Automatic annotation (TrEMBL):
<protein>
    <recommendedName>
        <fullName>HNH nuclease domain-containing protein</fullName>
    </recommendedName>
</protein>
Length: 158
DNA sequence: CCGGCCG
DNA sequence: CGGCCGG
C-alpha cells in the first residue's frame, strides 16, 4: 500500500501556460495544517469552502475560490488522499465527473484526509513537515509572504 | 481519460 | 449546468 508521501507526490496536476492547476496542492497543504492543529479530521463542505476559498484566490491564482475549492474537494478521493461522507447523496454532473455545487451546498457533506494519514500527521510531525515541504518546493517554490502563516504551517516548518 | 475550463 | 479541452 502506497505511503502518504508517495500518494501526495503522485498528484501531478495539468500544466497550463500560466502553470499547474494549484487546486489540489492548496487543499492538501490546508489539510496538513489542519491535522497539525488537531482540527477534526472530517469537516463540513461549508467550513472547508469558507476556509480554503480565500487561499485558493490569494495563493492558487483562481478567480473564484468557491468555484475553485469544489474541484479538489472531490477529485482528491480519486487520488486516494481524501474521504467524502454521504457521497452517494450528492447529485453528479458532467458524466459523473463531479457533484453539483447545489448538491454540495444542500447535503453539506463532511470530508477530509483518510484516518491512517491523519493519524500519521498528528503522530509523526516530521512526516507532516516533509509532505508539506514537498508540496511547497514543487508548487510554491517562490514562497509567498504569508503562505506559512495562512496555511498554519509556520511552526511546523521550523 | 478526467480535472479544471468555458459556451 | 454540463459539454469541452488538452496535459
Amino acid at each position: 500500500p502506497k505511503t502518504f508521501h508517495r500518494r501526495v507526490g503522485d498528484v501531478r496536476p495539468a500544466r497550463r501556460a500560466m502553470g499547474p492547476a494549484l487546486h489540489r496542492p492548496v487543499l492538501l497543504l490546508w489539510a496538513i495544517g489542519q491535522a497539525v492543529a488537531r482540527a477534526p479530521r472530517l469537516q463540513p463542505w461549508s467550513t472547508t469552502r469558507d476556509a480554503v476559498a480565500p487561499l485558493m484566490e490569494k495563493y492558487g491564482q483562481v478567480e473564484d475560490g468557491v468555484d475553485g475549492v469544489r474541484y479538489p474537494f472531490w477529485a482528491l478521493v480519486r487520488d486516494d488522499l481524501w474521504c467524502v461522507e454521504q457521497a452517494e447523496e450528492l447529485t453528479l454532473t458532467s458524466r459523473g465527473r463531479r457533484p453539483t455545487l447545489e448538491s454540495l451546498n444542500a447535503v453539506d457533506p463532511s470530508a477530509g484526509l483518510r484516518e491512517d494519514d491523519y493519524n500519521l500527521l498528528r503522530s509523526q510531525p516530521e512526516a507532516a513537515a516533509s509532505a508539506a515541504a514537498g508540496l511547497i518546493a514543487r508548487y510554491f517554490h517562490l514562497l509567498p509572504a504569508g503562505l506559512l502563516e495562512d496555511f498554519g504551517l509556520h511552526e511546523l516548518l521550523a
